[PDB]
């Protein structure tokens, strides 16, 4: 029962984590070996940059345009900017674009996705000059298709780069994200690493470290196995042939996601994968994007992402049960996540019901130990001392993800805030009631027993460590040490207006 569950948890989690670490290390070594053999000033591959956005801050859009203009790639054909809207408010983005780039702004009255002639020559005539499109407001997916059509009409290009309207790119991000495409002809898509620039909130730093760890281990293992699922925004690469082949199936699929938002980059990668085309991911290409600072917004978008995750894990299992020897790694990750969630729920229920101080201290101690080991590994890999803040991610995970997944599975099982936040409130109330019952049931003091002394010492040490971490974070905020160097200059530039 409990012994079997804890043993299975330990062995399976340790094996899976070791596998991810070794796979990420091997992928990094292989990528470094591939990069070390390339010649200097390599610009053989011709690529085009496509930018899509809607209701984007003009400052962030201007910074993204400047970062695109700061790229050192010497084989850039053109820049495609598509705005999902043709209203008076949407003209601010076009005006901002005219300040950073040419004034070649077009306002077609039709949408290529809903027109008989889907070719890009209907709305474009010259490919030498950069073009800006102000289409009627339809959605993010429609904007991507127009960019693909505009890039497809030029036979000179060989690949495309997809970034968000708020993405900040390094001077070598474009070259690094398109270099591995020519290394292996079987590679048709490359994923780019994404970082969070703003870290002025306790939630923002935690989600930034979570994203960094995700890109480091899961995407690294997927890159090593050449079966990457996380491909798309805010930084990615795609070859012209695969997008030309799969543009129609991607846009003809029924969409039930966010209205005029959340362009389906998941199903595009699924379409690439189901055709037997290998996909790799690189961490050298670095992209910068913002993160929400509201816990409620975080919870609701996690619920939406959990629903997505369900549909796309079914889809990717169906698509990856074709590779034969390979393709089972995604299914293994799926079962790993499902069993991890199930065992966390079972362990929490067991701890709530049995209410014994002996086992709870051991469980919290081993959880703290493994979290500290993970944080130390993250700090060693990132060469940054700020990665130790990941120990606080367990609290936000337990308090936000579990209600989000519960709501996601309840929605798809067999009043706007009732279906979004009532489940979280009930979960919090249940956790509080379980804690109160545990404290009341075990309310006693006995210093003549070593086991009680050991449990009390462990609890006191855990609380002391948590308080020390919180104090370190608080003093770091005042000294502005935790602030990203990119964030500081962005804040100064915003202050200068």
């Amino acid at each position: 029962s409990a012994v079997w569950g804890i043993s299975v948890y330990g062995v399976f989690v340790l094996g899976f984590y070791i596998a991810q670490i070794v796979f990420s290390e091997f992928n990094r070594m292989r990528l470094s070996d591939w990069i070390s053999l390339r010649p200097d000033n390599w610009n053989a591959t011709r690529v085009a940059v496509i930018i899509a956005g809607y209701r984007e801050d003009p400052f962030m859009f201007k910074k993204c345009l400047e970062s695109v203009r700061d790229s050192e790639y010497g084989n850039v054909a053109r820049l495609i900017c598509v705005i999902d809207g043709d209203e008076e408010e949407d003209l601010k983005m076009a005006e901002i674009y005219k300040q950073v780039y040419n004034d070649n702004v077009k306002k077609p009255g039709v949408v290529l996705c809903e027109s008989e002639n889907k070719n890009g020559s209907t709305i474009d005539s010259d490919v030498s000059k950069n073009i800006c499109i102000l289409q009627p407001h339809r959605g993010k997916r429609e904007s991507l298709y127009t960019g693909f059509q505009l890039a497809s009409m030029d036979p000179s290009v060989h690949a495309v780069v997809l970034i968000d309207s708020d993405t900040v790119l390094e001077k070598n991000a474009i070259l690094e994200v398109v270099y591995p495409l020519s290394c292996d002809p079987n590679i048709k898509a490359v994923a780019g690493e994404c970082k969070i620039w703003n870290t002025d909130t306790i939630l923002s730093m935690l989600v930034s470290w979570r994203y960094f760890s995700a890109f480091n281990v899961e995407r690294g293992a997927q890159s090593l196995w050449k079966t990457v699922q996380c491909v798309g925004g805010p930084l990615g690469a795609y070859t012209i042939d695969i997008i030309n082949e799969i543009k129609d199936p991607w846009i003809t699929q029924t969409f039930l996601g966010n209205k005029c938002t959340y362009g389906d980059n998941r199903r595009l990668t699924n379409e690439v994968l189901m055709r037997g085309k290998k996909i790799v991911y690189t961490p050298f290409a670095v992209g910068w994007s913002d993160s929400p600072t509201n816990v409620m917004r975080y919870i609701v978008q996690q619920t939406r992402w959990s629903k997505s995750w369900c549909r796309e894990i079914w889809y990717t299992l169906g698509s990856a049960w074709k590779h034969g020897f390979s393709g089972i790694y995604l299914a293994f990750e799926c079962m790993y996540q499902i069993m991890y969630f199930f065992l966390v729920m079972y362990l929490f229920s067991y701890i709530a019901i049995k209410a014994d101080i002996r086992a709870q201290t051991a469980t919290v101690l081993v959880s703290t130990l493994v979290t500290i080991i993970k944080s130390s590994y993250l700090a060693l890999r990132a060469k940054n001392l700020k990665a130790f803040y990941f120990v606080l991610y367990t609290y936000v995970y337990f308090f936000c993800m579990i209600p989000a997944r519960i709501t996601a599975m309840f929605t798809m099982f067999d009043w706007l805030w009732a279906k979004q936040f009532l489940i979280t409130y009930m979960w919090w109330a249940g956790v509080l009631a379980a804690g109160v019952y545990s404290i009341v049931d075990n309310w006693y003091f006995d210093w003549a027993d070593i086991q009680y002394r050991f449990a009390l010492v462990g609890i006191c040490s855990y609380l002391v460590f948590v308080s020390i971490v919180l104090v370190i974070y608080l003093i770091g905020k005042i000294t502005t040490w935790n602030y990203t160097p990119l964030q500081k200059e962005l804040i100064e530039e915003r202050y200068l207006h």
Partner: nanobody, 117 residues
Framework: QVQLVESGGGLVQAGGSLRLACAAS????????LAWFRRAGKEREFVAA????????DYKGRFTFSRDNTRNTMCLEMNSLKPEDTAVYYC????????????????????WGQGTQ
């Protein structure tokens, strides 16, 4: 937004070397194309150009292009002289906002700088 100011020159016999420096005050986004021209009684002719990020084109093997990339100061020294190379050199800038293609036509260079020699 940007202004180009040159430096160096003078009357030098065919036996010797000269160094011309073109300086800028502003942001060039590290993507604009920088070119050089020799003559202002004939039309301006191409000499040498190179992108800020990297690369370089001639028409040479005699004149090389160098960039500090930190103080926004350029340099282009000449090895050996000929009787027909004496002219008012100019510093050229091409804007990449309109297009990313590299053109030898001086007309596409909207920004111009004053000459010294």
């Amino acid at each position: 937004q940007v202004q180009l100011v040159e430096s160096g020159g003078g009357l030098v016999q065919a036996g010797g070397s000269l160094r011309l420096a073109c300086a800028a005050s502003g942001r060039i986004f590290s993507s604009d194309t920088l070119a050089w021209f020799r003559r202002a009684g004939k039309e301006r002719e191409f000499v040498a150009a190179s992108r800020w990020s990297g690369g370089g084109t001639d028409y040479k093997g005699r004149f090389t292009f160098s960039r500090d990339n930190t103080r926004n100061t350029m340099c282009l020294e000449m090895n050996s002289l000929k009787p027909e190379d004496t002219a008012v050199y100019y510093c050229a800038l091409r804007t990449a906002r309109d297009s990313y293609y590299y053109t030898r036509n001086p007309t596409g260079y909207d920004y111009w700088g004053q000459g010294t020699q």
